[PDB]
Design a protein around this ligand. Sequence first.
Ligand SMILES: CC(=O)N[C@@H]1[C@@H](O)[C@H](O)[C@@H](CO)O[C@H]1O
Ligand SMILES: [Ca+2]
Length: 217
Amino acid sequence: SCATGPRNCKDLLDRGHFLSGWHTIYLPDCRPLTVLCDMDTDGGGWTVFQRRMDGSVDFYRDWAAYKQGFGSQLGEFWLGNDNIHALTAQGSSELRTDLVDFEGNHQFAKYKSFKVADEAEKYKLVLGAFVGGSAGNSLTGHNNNFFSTKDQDNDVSSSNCAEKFQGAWWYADCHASNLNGLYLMGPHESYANGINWSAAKGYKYSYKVSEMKVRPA
Ligand SMILES: CC(=O)N[C@@H]1[C@@H](O)[C@H](O)[C@@H](CO)O[C@H]1O
Ligand SMILES: [Ca+2]
């Protein structure tokens, strides 16, 4: 039941679910949602809301798609902005970003809190202090920005960043990170339109794997 069920992946870890995989949790209003738990990385108990690995899924999508979520439990997905809001509203959730390049190097970044607002406030990013990690910091520059898609420009640029740059993000003018960008497979000649984390590999290298995930702080 909702009353006795888990609220997130940390609750499931505490109950002795030790393998990563898809589990049912209960959101604050008791709506059930199936989510990917990362039980292995950095203590486990992370709820994963973004995953890229192979370029099989098109991420250049509209507001409605990002609002409801898209992709596959078997592979790449975006969990959905309504879902991410519900998951991060109550309490305080830390954020971890996990990255792998095409040369096999693992890199990460961690933030002390992470929340997205509701749709009325355009799923605005509310980001806490950078903790550290080998990937460096490419998200703080996005704090307090609305989410934007190609069809809904909420950025702080005279341009359309989502169109520029071929992704969906809390764009400013325009970005330091672009993890929902094109799956460009390592070095690319086009500027800043790949799966880029500029603090680590810059604006002209697209990562092999990207994962974004949250856990109670
Ligand atoms: C790819 C991209 O958006 N790079 C921008 C750069 O063009 C801009 O001059 C600067 C202003 O703060 O912010 C960077 O993030
Ligand atoms: Ca704009």
